[PDB]
């Protein structure tokens, strides 16, 4: 599970510095080839991702 944790933590680090909700350093990436299925709330790991972005936002 390290890859899964590290991609979710790294995407959360670049999501948390966003200037607007849908103008993130990840919305551009999904459309530029980067398959990341946990961005959608359909994947269970999104609920942990939301906590990590909330934590990284708290760390601002």
């Amino acid at each position: 599970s390290a890859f899964d944790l590290d991609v979710v933590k790294l995407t959360a680090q670049f999501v948390a510095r966003n200037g607007r909700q849908f103008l993130t350093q990840l919305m551009q990436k999904e459309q530029r080839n980067y398959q990341f299925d946990f961005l959608r709330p359909q994947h269970s790991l999104f609920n942990y991702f939301t906590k990590l972005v909330e934590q990284y936002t708290k760390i601002l």
């Binding site: 944790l5 933590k9 990436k29 980067y34 708290k58």
Partner: protein, 421 residues
């Protein structure tokens, strides 16, 4: 390394876990003094960890202000995300489950039913911090100090109870002349008492208590905190009164007070500070001092035995005829035991014994029913191995050649000769 984000997030999380754990402790009920003090000492070590983590968290933001503009640049950038994500494609075949980043901190600062000491503090021991007579904050041993005190006075006209009346003194007439050898004893008695105060209240800030006593000493005790209405002002060091505050102030700069006698503020300083600390700590421990005095009076009045006790604080014939309670064991039936010889004979040929023989790989038989060891069973299965036959057509080949005295061939050899030609 993401000092800005990941490290500060982890340190903030570790702090939250420490707060949750000592909150869980202050939520739970406590039943006896030993385990109360043990948890309070455990929570002290957790606070030491919390302060250190909070230290490191505060000394990790200087380079953060160096990179904050580049970090805040969420539009111009993106390539670094890709570069790191491409490096996350390293070592794909890492077949391992990883549920330990939050579970190990949570189960680290928690404890397991047999021992109410968490994994950080798991070797912590109250009996390396208290002696038995002290009973974990219940009493103070002053017996040892009483012995050192007998040696100091050079006479035995003084009981333990008489000794306690000496330690009830506060700001009155001293026991001995304050410039004599009483000072070395007072230093040692205090060092014990000061260690004891902090030892029995490990959740209270030691540095706060020390800094408060130091500040009260400098701003009040050295500055004339004892006034009468010779009565007027008393100075601890020079052991004398004084008329008015004007002549007290001008005496504080004179050679006899500063350095020009043997009871001065250069030489007798540590002892005078010590005499103030023993006073303030004995006031803070006034309940415990009363409890020791009561315990001494209760221990003194006892008989022998009371003192020693406080220092300690059917069908037999039917089972015989049936064959019960007989030593028997069947190693073939999963090393089970039998209470009789007929039960051992029926357990050797049973469902569990045959299942264990089939799982071991050795098929049972009529001669191998009473086998117990597995070494004899392999030889029994080898000798039982279809007796010794398997030879119906191991020579019939009818070799033409000369057909009279030359046709030595086997079954497979004649089959290969017929298939080839």
């Amino acid at each position: 390394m993401e000092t800005i984000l990941e490290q500060q997030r982890r340190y903030h999380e570790e702090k939250e876990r420490l707060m949750d754990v000592m909150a869980k402790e202050m939520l739970t009920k406590k039943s006896t003094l030993r385990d109360q003090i043990n948890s309070d000492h455990r929570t002290r070590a957790m606070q030491d960890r919390y302060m250190e983590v909070s230290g490191n968290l505060r000394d990790l933001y200087d380079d953060k202000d160096g990179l904050r503009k580049e970090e805040l640049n969420a539009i111009s950038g993106p390539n670094e995300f890709a570069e790191f994500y491409n490096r996350l494609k390293q070592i794909k075949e890492f077949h391992r489950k990883h549920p330990n980043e939050i579970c190990v901190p949570m189960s680290v600062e928690f404890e397991e039913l047999l021992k109410a000491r968490e994994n950080p503090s798991e070797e912590a021991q109250n009996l390396v911090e208290f002696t038995d007579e002290e009973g974990y904050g219940r009493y103070l041993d002053l017996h040892d100090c009483y012995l050192k005190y007998i040696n100091l006075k050079a006479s035995e006209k003084l009981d333990y109870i008489t000794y306690l009346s000496i330690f009830d003194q506060l700001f009155d007439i001293p026991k001995e002349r304050k410039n004599a050898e009483y000072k070395r004893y007072l230093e040692m008695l205090l060092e014990y008492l000061q260690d004891y105060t902090d030892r029995v209240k490990p959740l209270q800030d030691q540095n706060e208590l020390f800094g408060k006593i130091q500040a009260e000493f400098e701003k009040k005790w050295e500055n004339g905190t004892f006034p009468g209405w010779e009565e007027r002002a008393q100075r601890l060091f020079s052991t004398k009164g004084k008329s008015l505050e004007s002549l007290d102030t001008s005496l504080f700069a004179k050679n006899p007070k500063s350095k020009g006698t043997k009871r001065d503020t250069e030489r007798n300083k540590d002892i005078a500070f010590l005499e103030a600390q023993i006073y303030e700590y004995v006031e803070i421990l006034g309940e415990q001092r009363h409890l020791t005095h009561e315990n001494v009076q209760r221990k003194q009045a006892r008989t022998g035995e009371e003192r020693e006790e406080e220092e300690e604080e059917i069908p037999y014939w039917l089972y015989k005829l049936h064959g019960l309670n007989i030593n028997y064991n069947c190693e073939i039936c999963g090393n089970y035991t039998y209470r009789g010889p007929k039960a051992f004979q029926r357990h050797f040929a049973e469902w569990r014994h045959a299942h264990g023989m089939r799982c071991l790989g050795i098929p049972n038989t009529a001669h191998f029913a009473n086998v117990t060891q597995i070494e004899d069973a392999v030889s029994l299965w080898a000798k039982l191995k279809l007796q010794k036959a398997s030879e119906r057509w191991q020579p019939d080949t009818e070799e033409e050649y000369e057909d009279s005295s030359g046709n030595v061939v086997n079954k497979k050899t004649y089959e290969d000769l017929k298939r080839q030609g």
